[PDB]
Automatic annotation (TrEMBL), chain C:
Belongs to the resistance-nodulation-cell division (RND) (TC 2.A.6) family. The lineage of its organism: Bacteria, Pseudomonadati, Pseudomonadota, Betaproteobacteria, Burkholderiales. This is Heavy metal cation tricomponent efflux pump ZneA(CzcA-like). It comes from Cupriavidus metallidurans (strain ATCC 43123 / DSM 2839 / NBRC 102507 / CH34) (Ralstonia metallidurans). The gene is zneA. It is found in: Cell membrane. The chain holds residues 698 to 747 of 1039 of the full protein.
Length: 45, 958, 50, 959
């Protein structure tokens, strides 16, 4: 049932989220980029 | 340009280069592995499987209607057909550029809407390539019988394997299918008044359940069921038509499969769906097999493969890996010996692996197969060269961005010229494209990568004593004698070049060996079985053979037209590094060939499985070369082909030669006397029914058991149709309703007829197969093609002796090769725009390749041609660099540029050195590139620092 | 919500045919199947056009 | 900009341009030749063929439900269908962009009676018509030669989808029954045929062993000859009732083939292989004095087309170079500025080579050449005159008006990709070729050219009239405004078409004959028709196709003929007669052959006309309605009306009248009182009378039908039919007229349903006058009648073509003027924009000059003219506005007076390149002459207003 797609979607997010959390890490280049990158959890709250 | 700003991005550009490298490895992960590319072109056969009929009745009533309704399909290139014992088999092969499913569509459009008499249903063969047979297996068991093994095969194994995605079908050979045989004694047949057809139209009837729809009772609706279905044999024996034996049985056998001391067993062939990836599917069929052996099949019955494609895959991965490893190792070691410093050595060394990932990602994202054959032939020592110069400057300069931006422009130039020469490899199509194109792709990509690395990272990364002035002496060491050596050596390349072989493939060793074994005409399945058994006896004598499997006759699909007189033999081997003997490879083939000539009635042709497939789908027959003998009369064409067979057998180049079509077999021809049957009240139909059912034994109906299905067949009893007299004794039923032996109204005689009729585009021919072993193609075909067409008795009905095989293959290949090769010359001439001498620095390497080829007795095949492409590609860079640095101007650069030149000429001609080593499956193709490149580079380098600077002081001053 | 998808086994009036009887009575099971499919079931015979 | 590096890159740009030269020559050597572009739309028809059956038991239950399911096929555009004796054939034409095999696949899916799919060919795929000639051989022998040698051979030519036979005689085996010995014999035609059919088989007994050998068993019962059949009446060889008859020069009964070009394959390319095949047939295969000889051969047309276009482009070339030579004075400069033409052409082939664009000769003939060099000759003029060291100091002065002027002529040439269908297929390769070559002219004039380093009285005459511009505001704007409406009411009177005649090699005829006519009488009428057609010195061969062929892709009766009329080369026309005048001489002549109604068209275009509208004519009028009688009544009205209008030439009702049929109904109660099945009767009619084939005898690779049928004069008339007998349940003969109404009843011959509507078609040709005014008049006169309603009436054919073309013109026009003004912004622009009517004047006075109309071709012509005209305006206004920016009035003779030569030069080369294209003498110039006329005429009256009213306009506006 919908659990096939549930698992597919959620696991996919468990795959392609460090895809950008490492991409933004490199992109942000003014050490400090980590600090700027910590804006994520604060929003998650 | 960007060399300026990339320096201040050191960390950043390094970081992304790590990230890229990650995506590099990832790109390599989702990359299709080909150990042996799909060499075959786009083909498709149409199969008409009539059960019990003979050749004359099959060609005229099916092959002629089909060929009539087919010849104009949008896509055709070659069209062939073979008509045989109850089989119209029409092979079509399309032009280069036609999609499989598209082609199968057009074809299937043209084959349906027909009308085939004996209930014949023209279907299509499964979508597969010659090289698609990936998993050959057999069912072993100490305790169970062949009927049970056959049942397992049909109802469990083949179904399960069919569930594997990428498997288009599973081809069965051997065993015993189960019929419900009904033995009619003809004595009480025309005694109870009604004859065969009355029965076979009655027993065909009472076996079809009835549904009565809904019957209502109260508020319920019960569906009505009538169970009138013949189940077991007792439900069969008790059937009536008016007021004989009944047993399990089998149809006459299409084939018999044999093995190691095992006369009668059963095999399956896993047919890979076209384009799908072998190893990927292999995982699936492996899991399926394990699931069968461990769970589905009864314990004590095991599926045991004897040919598996993943074996060759492992051998290939091993060998190629070994080649790349030894390559990079040697390149790094010479880097160490020539630089001294391990730090810089490693700095230039990492240009190699990093570029690979940069090449992989481009191949991955834009649909390119990871072809292992066109990868082991990679040089490495060519890649680093750019970076190498970026080192040679800096290291020999003691900011650094200035020397790198200095040497940058003469590297982008060198980049193009070396990445250009590889472009002609994209020209040739067909089977020489699926094998060499990914190499050129990977090289170009790894050159984009090598350039980017050399110019945007390398700068950022922050006994010879006798060799030095000895060179300073010969420099000082006469314009006439110089150009004399130049021209003389040039004619050296011309002479030694004009005198060399011209193959097409360097054999390409697979794990095993395939045999086209040929037995005497019109023999019985039993006799053929004995003979095959003895052949396997003869084969197992050699210790090098692992398993030997025979296929006599044909599989039950109809995708082969083979008679019981034909055998195909699989011969597997032990690992090459395991043979407790001294035999080579061609020595093993020659030994087996000698032994096989000692057995009577057995002619044996040698080839390999996948290549037997593609050779067949190409030529029309299973041999390297074939000689077609067109003609409308059989006897004539057979005579001509006899002459051509002896003629070709003569030449000391053709190791095997024989006519492909079996001779006219005998046959008991039952003609029907018209005027007599008229004068006696008998119908031809009745006779035909007696033959087809009473003698032939057509299946009446079909019985179901669970998920299984069997054929109820009716046929005259044992010891009744044994011979012409007996058959003539069989009776019918006139209008008088009694007895008339067919001997009264039918002429039953012993005639002969053709076994197989190989129609070629409605131009009947007769194939003369020939395999060559030793002599090349040019030296062979010279004498051969010379002799043949000038010793044949013209002309009559056609009789134009044509050729086929790797002949027109090699011809078209070389044709396109020399079509695109001179085109790249002007391309790499406008680049050099002075350019004349650098362009003339090309045939220097030619003789260098020729000496190494002549040394190793090789030939000028497509492989070695590609070798000369890489060679001509890189050997000009040395000229460019020994010109940019460069009448006393010689020592302004020569003595200075001598060190990196050797360094580049060392690393390049050292990566292909381990790829110049034989042994192990997967090196056969790559080797002739190494033999050309290394040997070419050694002499061409040993000369470029001698005659070229002595040619630069002879310009615009004379 | 929760339910078994497949409907339970429904009753059927099953007309099996005794072979040995129709044998010792001279009758074909095809006749019976036609009796049911047509006589009981009621198969369409032809196609009328207006 | 990039002239800088280029000036120091002379040798390099020269070498690379040489490279593009070589790859350009190579690109042209790998380009498909198309002389008559595949005008057709994506269509496919389904054939449900029922042999020997009449015309109402074929539509009631066959065409209708098929039409129901098939109507829902994706990509469907127009759905037509026709039902009749023999068959139901349903035509489906699709929307544009619908790929062939895809469509045929959807169709094939939906149709899954035995409905089949017709061969995949265009209505212009019939590329090689031929006939088997001999002096000694008989039509049956020629028929077998056709069937088993010629067609099987030509079917091997790659690109040939199928071959269509017409004429000759298929051979069958037949016994000629005499029911006299069927009377008291109680064997029916069905038992006779089931018997005679079931005993034709060759069983095999599989493998019978004998020691170590295993021999196959062969039973042989296949019938071989009528000898083996003979074991009553006369059993003989014979032939089925004749399909149609084909006739030629005095030959009434021969046999022909039609080579069908597979869809989307190159005609000449396939013609090569066909030529190989045909040659092989004559040389080595066929018996001597049996020669396959063509009468239509597409190769001829390709020849005449490449000759016409070749002559055109050559003449244009030499004329343009003549202009350059006469102008510059220096042959050196003339050559170095001329070599832009071959350079750009080679530089345009490559871009067409990689975009896979074909080489339409019809549209490549219409290239101006002298409009390509205008990007280059202005520079040369500005250097070899204005300048009189540093070359690219002068190339910068006229640079901006050139880059922007040429991007303007490109953006103007651009919106030809708007329209679709036929008006696109015809004029599309030109748009691309011109685009690419234009960008090449740009890339040459400001690159390779900088690397290269009676007029006397014309000079001050110009100075005088420019001094007349000093003042006269209301007079200048007077001329402008007055001529604006002066051309607005000149193109308001112009006639409007859709395309010119487009002359092919020959002439096709849809010849209509009296209803119900036998095949013999039809044959005689055709004989006469053809003997009257040969009464001209200009007719090479005349071929008639009366009736039907073998396949069934035509539902034709003997009353229907299609005629092919081949001509002599126009070069050798002794009789002083124009082709159109030949056509009217033919029409007049044909109005003196009794019963012979003749439709006039052409072999290629007739097909697409039919697939488009419905019937084989330029125009049709469809009268819809579910009643046969009334729709035919109204159709009689519309016919009689339309045939009175002076524009309509031929007019007929496509659907042939109802015909008598001897009809045998069966009496139920009678055969219920005599114990007889209707199936016995139908068997009697289908086998006995009808003569249905019973079985199939094989001889070598050939095969023939074995047929059983009653002898002649046993089915002679309705009496004789009614008089033959058939047995009953009482075991005794029963006469047929005892249980069956054998009578004579009128039935419909052909039922045509389009878009699920029963309609009748009044087909008619526009030949004689105009299209716009004509259709206006006639269609207006149609509204008088139409006696409603119980019935709708529509127009079709090139009417829809005109509509789509016009609508597309109205769509395109403001689209370009948007960007054109946008590009002309900054570098006020309205001043330059209003140069289009200046060119429009000549473009319309030239149409009235030679006697023409306003077709899509001439429209594209105006699209072209606007470019060069606005280029001249741009150059003028730019050099003016830059020269200056009364003291300002001085600039009107200074900044404009010195632009005399560049403007005149451009306006000359661009107007002499199309003069040869304004020639008609030859096949392939029948579409170029519109653009040629529009540009040539519209440029020689545009410059005179660019150099006079325009400077006065600039001086008047900027104050
Ligand atoms: Zn095989």
């Amino acid at each position: 049932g919908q659990f096939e797609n549930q698992q597919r979607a959620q696991a996919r997010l468990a795959v392609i989220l460090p895809m950008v959390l490492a991409l933004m890490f490199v992109l942000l280049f003014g050490r400090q980029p980590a600090l700027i990158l910590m804006a994520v959890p604060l929003a998650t709250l | 340009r960007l060399v300026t700003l990339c320096f201040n991005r050191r960390g950043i550009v390094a970081l992304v280069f790590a990230m890229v490298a990650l995506y590099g490895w990832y790109a390599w992960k989702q990359l299709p592995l080909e150990a042996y590319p799909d060499i075959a072109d786009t083909t498709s056969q149409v199969v008409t499987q009539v059960n019990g009929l003979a050749a004359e009745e099959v060609e005229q009533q099916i092959t002629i209607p089909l060929e009539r309704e087919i010849m104009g399909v949008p896509g055709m290139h070659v069209m062939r057909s073979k008509s045989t014992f109850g089989l119209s088999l029409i092979t079509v092969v399309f032009k280069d550029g036609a999609e499989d499913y598209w082609s199968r569509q057009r074809l299937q459009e043209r084959i349906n809407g027909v009308s085939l008499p004996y209930g014949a249903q023209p279907s299509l063969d499964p979508l597969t390539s010659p090289i698609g047979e990936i998993y050959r297996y057999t069912l072993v068991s100490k305790t169970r019988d062949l009927r049970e093994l056959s049942e397992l095969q049909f109802w469990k194994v083949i179904p399960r394997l069919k569930q594997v995605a990428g498997v288009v079908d599973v081809a069965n050979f051997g065993g015993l299918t189960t019929q419900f045989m009904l033995e009619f004694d003809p004595v009480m047949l025309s005694k109870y008044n009604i004859s065969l057809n009355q029965i076979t139209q009655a027993i065909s009837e009472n076996n079809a359940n009835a549904g009565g729809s809904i019957l209502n009772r109260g508020e319920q609706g019960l569906v009505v069921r009538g169970v009138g279905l013949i189940r077991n044999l007792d439900d069969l024996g008790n059937i009536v038509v008016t007021q004989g034996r009944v047993v399990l049985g089998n149809p006459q056998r299409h084939g018999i499969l044999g093995m190691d001391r095992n006369p009668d067993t059963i095999q399956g062939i896993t047919l890979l769906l076209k384009n799908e990836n072998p190893s990927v599917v292999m995982e699936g069929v492996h899991a399926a097999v394990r699931d069968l052996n461990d769970n589905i099949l009864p314990k004590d019955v095991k599926v045991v493969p004897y040919i598996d494609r993943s074996n060759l895959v492992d051998a290939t991965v091993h060998t190629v890996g070994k080649t790349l490893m030894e390559g990079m190792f040697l390149v790094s070691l010479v880097l160490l010996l020539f630089l001294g410093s391990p730090r810089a050595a490693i700095i230039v060394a990492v240009t190699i692996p990093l570029s690979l990932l940069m090449a992989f990602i481009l191949m991955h994202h834009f649909k390119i197969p990871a072809n292992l054959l066109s990868l082991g032939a990679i040089d490495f020592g060519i890649i680093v060269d750019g970076a190498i110069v970026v080192m040679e400057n800096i290291l020999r300069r003691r900011d650094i961005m200035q020397s790198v931006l200095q040497v940058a422009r003469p590297i982008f130039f060198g980049m193009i010229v070396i990445i250009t020469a590889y472009l002609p490899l994209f020209a040739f199509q067909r089977i020489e494209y699926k094998l060499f194109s990914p190499m050129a792709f990977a090289v170009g990509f790894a050159l984009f990568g090598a350039l980017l690395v050399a110019l945007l990272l390398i700068p950022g990364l922050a006994a010879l004593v006798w060799l030095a002035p000895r060179y300073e002496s010969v420099l000082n060491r006469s314009t006439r004698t110089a150009i004399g050596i130049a021209v003389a050596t040039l004619v050296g390349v011309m002479i030694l070049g004009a005198t060399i072989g011209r193959d097409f493939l360097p054999y390409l060793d697979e794990g095993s060996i395939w045999l086209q074994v040929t037995l005497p005409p019109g023999i019985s399945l039993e006799k053929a079985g004995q003979m095959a058994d003895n052949l396997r006896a003869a084969t197992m004598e050699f210790p090098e053979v692992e398993h030997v499997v025979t296929q006599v006759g044909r599989n039950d699909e109809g995708t082969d037209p083979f008679s019981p007189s034909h055998i195909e033999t699989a011969v597997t081997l032990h690992p090459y590094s395991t043979w407790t003997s001294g035999r080579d490879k061609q020595q093993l083939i020659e030994a087996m060939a000698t032994r096989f000539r000692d057995l009577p009635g057995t002619q044996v042709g040698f080839s390999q499985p996948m290549i037997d497939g593609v050779l067949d789908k190409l030529a029309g027959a299973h041999s390297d070369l074939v000689v077609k003998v067109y003609g409308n009369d059989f006897a004539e064409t057979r005579q001509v082909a006899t002459a051509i067979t002896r003629l070709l057998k003569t030449v000391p180049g053709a190791q095997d030669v024989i006519i492909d079509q079996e001779p006219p077999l005998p046959q008991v021809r039952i003609d029907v006397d018209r005027a007599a049957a008229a004068r006696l009240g008998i119908n031809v139909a009745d006779v035909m029914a007696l033959i087809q059912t009473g003698i032939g034994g057509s299946p009446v109906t079909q019985v179901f058991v669970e998920d299984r299905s069997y054929n109820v067949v009716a046929r005259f009893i044992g010891s009744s149709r044994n011979d012409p007299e007996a058959i003539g004794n069989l009776t019918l039923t006139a209008a008088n309703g009694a007895h008339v032996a067919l001997a009264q109204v039918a002429h039953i005689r012993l005639a002969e007829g053709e076994t197989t009729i190989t129609r070629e585009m409605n131009k009947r021919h007769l194939t003369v197969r020939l395999n060559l072993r030793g002599r090349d193609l040019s030296t062979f075909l010279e004498e051969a093609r010379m002799r043949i067409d000038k010793e044949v008795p013209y002309d009559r009905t056609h009789i134009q002796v044509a050729w086929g095989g790797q002949f027109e293959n090699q011809q078209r290949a070389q044709a396109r090769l020399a079509v695109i090769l001179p085109m790249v010359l002007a391309l790499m001439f406008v680049l050099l725009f002075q350019p004349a001498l650098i362009l003339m620095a090309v045939p220097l390497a030619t003789l260098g390749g020729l000496v190494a080829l002549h040394l190793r007795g090789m030939t000028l095949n497509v492989s070695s041609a590609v070798g000369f492409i890489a060679l001509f590609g890189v050997a000009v860079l040395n000229a460019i660099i020994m010109i940019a640095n460069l009448k006393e101007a010689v020592v302004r650069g020569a003595g200075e540029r001598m060190r990196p030149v050797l360094m580049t000429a060392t690393v390049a001609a050292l990566g292909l050195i381990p790829a110049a080593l034989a042994h192990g499956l997967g090196s056969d193709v790559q080797r002739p590139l190494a033999t050309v490149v290394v040997g070419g580079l050694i002499t061409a380098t040993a000369l470029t620092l001698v005659l070229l600077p002595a040619l630069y002081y002879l310009i615009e001053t004379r």
